[PDB]
Design a protein around this ligand. Structure first.
Ligand SMILES: Nc1ncnc2c1ncn2[C@@H]1O[C@H](COP(=O)(O)OP(=O)(O)OP(=O)(O)O)[C@@H](O)[C@H]1O
Ligand SMILES: Nc1ncnc2c1ncn2[C@@H]1O[C@H](COP(=O)(O)OP(=O)(O)OP(=O)(O)O)[C@@H](O)[C@H]1O
Ligand SMILES: Cn1c(=O)c2c(ncn2C[C@@H](O)CO)n(C)c1=O
Ligand SMILES: [Ca+2]
Ligand SMILES: [Zn+2]
Ligand SMILES: [Zn+2]
Lengths: 742, 146, 48, 49
């Protein structure tokens, strides 16, 4: 509310804030003395946080060098002494933490129980030199020291830091915002220099983004980021998925689609983090929890299981090499290994059993780890289509979309969005399209009882059922399970792993089948995937080339049958002659097989026509065969392969260099930012970091709506509506305030 | 140094010093660096070739073993694929060097129940190993130049 | 050559208007600018 | 890095590098936190000298 903001700015609120700052700072210094007062100190820190929130809310919507920001800067100036006091409090305790973590403090420590005397603490601190002697005295007084004068530095440091975190982060956010919106107040420089330690500590946790304003001008937002969320982002698999997403969007992602795809990628990420958190390691229920631990271990070690299976396949094939065939036992022939040791044959059996076990464990691990993600995506897209497209209400599937036909089933299923977080899609779709399509029809489609809906809203209902395996069996929904199993069958990787299983099982019948598992190297290795993908990229063209080869060989075969048939005797003996081209099929097979394999062509394999009326026609026949089939067609194949390498390479180069040149968000060229030094780097890292955007998204999901600011509520509303206008396109803070900025 | 010292033992060792032309000349460095740029990919291609030849060898051992007599004389027959190792070495060595493929080096199956399966076997060998894999190598080299 | 012809045609089409020849960047300064310019301002189908 | 661990104690150390005062600068910079004596032992340098 701009009017309320101006009224407050002209109000006396400033003087009240000054008084609160003085009291806050002095009360903090007094309260740190004794532990008993720590609770009141916590309340004091929380009240300071609320005041800082008020001040930040006043900042909301402020342009650079806005008068509200300037007045707050003046208020900070007037309350400076208290400000330096508070910042010194914070930095002193942070330095106490890092110093006590330091080994030098430990070496000064000489006590088995780990306590430090007043004097030893003094010596260690003055040896670090960070702290003035008055500061050391204040710290010693704050530290509860027993009559023995020894201190537990661990608790001494730990007590203060949890409460100070929230207020410290809010202070850092306020200082950053004021610094950016008033680049030239030297008082604000001195404050920033004082607070640098706080700014350094909270720098990772701070997340900075830019959004398109409700006021149709760009704004900047600062938010908190949890360490767990950050770490989950840094986890390598998330990074690989991120690079995959970047490559895909850059190669075939439209600008309009791009940002929605980014939102979907962030949602999928969030789901993956949840899964990682659940699987992460810290009488029927006892067996169940042992089962859960076993499944979690399988999911964690899934890739290691795959590598182990590949190693077992390699070992099985190596042992299989010694395998041999002979008519004599160690008319039917006997197959047996040829090795002196005799330990292998038991070893092959053990290896086959272990390989099958590993493969089944891999099936289970893939299921638990990944199938939830697939169901999450499919449920999410189905819910989006129903909410907005209303396809099954109005449009219906094209009837050529097996995915839509299969999805028709899950609609009636009660469980439906088991993986998707929203369980209220049914009610929203009903509220939205019941007016047009009839509430009862939507209810029948969705398997949802209106009366049940209304009763749940009016009053809480708890029909708690007793625990039972039979009751769980009753609960299971057959139709939802059917839909899930259909999706599982459809997905490719599950099919490959089931192939692995089946081949191991048949290998137990005949060990030779285990060789097929060696092909898993393609999936296992990036390099083989690239090399084979080079061929797959042009696979249709290559197949059609093979078809053209068949056609041309067929025509040459027709000519051979009609006129050049005599020359196709492949038998030396005159008494028993073998003519290949007496029959069309034999002629075609002969050509296709021998001539194509032949470098010179069919002429090498058929008798020279020298001294024949048809000699000239045949030499033309052979040479044209050699040029068209032996030479060009293969050349087409190699050229397609070369084109594949070049195409993939230029795709990677294009993706990388576009990423480096332009922002994923605005699309602005690197040159505009780089006019200022390091401009594109700063813009990507701080102004436009996609990771910061995603962190903001989870911050909002975790945050209560009532606490949401106007900005946060604005973004949340557009997220729910799925409109992405808030994301900045072709605009930035720098450009908006450039003339003002310089 | 070491090669010169061993050359004093046997003068033949001095030939290795001829390879110094690569370091000496920019052009040889460029040409060889073209290969080195894709060296890992080329090695992995060789490994895939080994795997495919091994599978073809398994098929030969199980079903197409009879056709692997490389001895004219009936009294003394030499069967390469009675043993897995011999079959693998035979394939890897003769078939890869062969332009037409292993079919050139093994007896025609004409008038046999397995003739169709064998012709498929040979032609697929020729396409996958003789043609594509080498083609992968030359394409990698061309990509290196570019 | 043929591949680069197709790529060139497509990416030029996406970058510049068939009509004015203005770069996509000028329009895109405003959000969705090139898309709007092609669909409504400069649609060849609308001209026909 | 494992190999470089050795040269630290060596007196000659920056024989080729022009700066022979890196030891003293590093000491002045990080002795406050990590202990002067430990830096001296790591660098093979006698404070008294
Ligand atoms: N909006 C953006 N957000 C993040 N990076 C961006 C953005 N726009 C362009 N970039 C560029 O993309 C790159 C980000 O991907 P990058 O491969 O650097 O991953 P990273 O995790 O940032 O770092 P690293 O590759 O070292 O692990 C940076 O070079 C950055 O300049
Ligand atoms: N003057 C223009 N008129 C139309 N499209 C233009 C113009 N200038 C550039 N374009 C671009 O060319 C494309 C128009 O061809 P496009 O292949 O999209 O056919 P379409 O019928 O519009 O859509 P689709 O390909 O989905 O059938 C659009 O991407 C548009 O951005
Ligand atoms: C990805 N994602 C969620 O997962 C989500 C959500 N609203 C509630 N949840 C479930 C919640 O339990 C997650 O922790 N929104 C808006 C969202 O985008
Ligand atoms: Ca509120
Ligand atoms: Zn940007
Ligand atoms: Zn135009």
């Amino acid at each position: 509310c701009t009017g309320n903001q101006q009224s407050l700015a002209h109000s006396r609120l400033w003087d009240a804030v000054v008084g609160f700052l003085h009291v806050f700072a002095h009360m903090m210094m007094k309260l740190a003395q004794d532990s008993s007062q720590i609770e009141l100190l916590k309340e004091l820190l929380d009240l300071q946080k609320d005041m800082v929130v008020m001040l930040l809310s006043l900042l909301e919507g402020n342009v650079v060098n806005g008068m509200i920001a300037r007045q707050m800067v003046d208020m900070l100036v007037e309350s400076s002494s208290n400000v330096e006091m508070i910042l010194k409090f914070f930095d002193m305790f942070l330095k106490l933490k890092d110093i006590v973590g330091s080994e030098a403090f430990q070496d000064y420590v000489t006590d088995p129980r780990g306590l430090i005397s007043k004097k030893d603490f003094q010596k260690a601190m003055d040896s670090q030199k960070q702290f003035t002697g008055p500061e050391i005295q204040f710290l010693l007084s704050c530290s509860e020291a027993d009559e023995n004068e020894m201190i537990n530095f661990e608790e001494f440091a730990n007590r203060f830091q949890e409460p100070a975190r929230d207020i410290g982060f809010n202070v850092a956010v306020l200082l950053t915002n004021l610094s950016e919106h008033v680049p030239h107040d030297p008082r604000l420089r001195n404050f920033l220099e004082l607070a640098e330690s706080i700014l350094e500590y909270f720098r990772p946790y701070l997340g900075r983004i830019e959004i398109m304003g409700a006021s149709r001008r760009i704004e900047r937002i600062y938010f908190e980021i949890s360490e767990t969320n950050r770490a989950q982002w840094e986890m390598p698999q998330v990074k690989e998925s991120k690079r995959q997403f970047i490559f895909d969007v850059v190669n075939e992602g439209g600008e309009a689609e791009k940002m929605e795809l980014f939102v979907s990628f962030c949602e999928d990420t969030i789901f993956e983090m949840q899964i990682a958190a659940q699987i992460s390691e810290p009488f029927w229920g006892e067996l169940e929890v042992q089962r859960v631990k076993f499944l979690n271990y399988l999911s964690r070690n899934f890739y290691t299981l795959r590598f182990l299976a590949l190693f077992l396949a390699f070992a099985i094939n190596f042992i299989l090499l010694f395998y041999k065939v002979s008519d004599s036992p160690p008319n039917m022939v006997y197959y047996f290994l040829e090795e002196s040791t005799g330990y292998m044959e038991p070893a092959l059996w053990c290896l086959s059993l272990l390989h099958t076990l590993v493969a089944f464990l891999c099936i289970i691990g893939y299921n638990c780890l990944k199938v939830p993600l697939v169901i999450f995506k499919r449920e999410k897209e189905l819910a989006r289509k129903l909410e907005f497209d209303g396809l099954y209400i109005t449009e219906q599937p094209g009837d050529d979309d097996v995915k839509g036909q299969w999805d028709r089933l899950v609609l009636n299923t009660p469980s439906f969005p088991s993986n998707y977080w929203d369980k209220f899609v049914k009610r929203k779709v009903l509220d939205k399209h019941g007016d047009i399509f009839g509430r009862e029809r939507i209810a029948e489609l969705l398997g949802m009882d209106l009366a049940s809906l209304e009763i749940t809203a009016h009053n809480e209902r708890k029909p708690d059922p007793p625990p039972g395996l039979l009751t769980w069996l009753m609960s299971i929904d057959v139709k939802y399970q059917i839909w899930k199993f259909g999706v599982i069958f459809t997905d490719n990787s599950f099919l490959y792993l089931g192939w692995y299983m089946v081949m191991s099982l048949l290998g137990h019948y005949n060990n030779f089948f285990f060789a097929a598992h060696l092909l898993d190297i393609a999936m296992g290795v990036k390099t083989l995937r690239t090399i084979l993908s080079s061929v797959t990229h042009n696979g249709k063209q290559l197949v059609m080339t093979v078809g053209l080869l068949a056609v041309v060989v067929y025509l040459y075969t027709v000519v051979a049958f009609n006129f050049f048939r005599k020359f196709y005797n492949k038998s030396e003996d005159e008494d028993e002659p073998d003519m290949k081209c007496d029959d069309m099929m034999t002629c075609y097979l002969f050509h296709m097989y021998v001539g194509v394999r032949a470098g010179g062509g069919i002429g090498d394999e058929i008798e020279d026509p020298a001294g024949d009326e048809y000699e000239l026609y045949r030499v033309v026949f052979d040479i044209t065969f050699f040029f068209f089939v032996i030479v060009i067609l293969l050349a087409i194949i190699q050229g397609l392969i070369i084109d594949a390498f070049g195409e993939l390479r230029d795709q990677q180069e294009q993706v990388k260099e576009d990423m480096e040149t332009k922002c994923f968000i605005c699309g602005i060229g690197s040159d505009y930012f780089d006019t200022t030094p390091h401009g594109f780097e700063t813009h990507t890292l701080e102004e436009h970091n996609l990771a910061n955007y995603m962190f903001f998204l989870m911050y909002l999901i975790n945050k209560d709506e009532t606490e949401h600011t106007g900005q946060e509520s604005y973004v949340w509303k557009m997220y729910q509506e799925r409109c992405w206008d808030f994301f900045p396109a072709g605009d930035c803070f720098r450009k908006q305030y450039e003339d003002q900025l310089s």
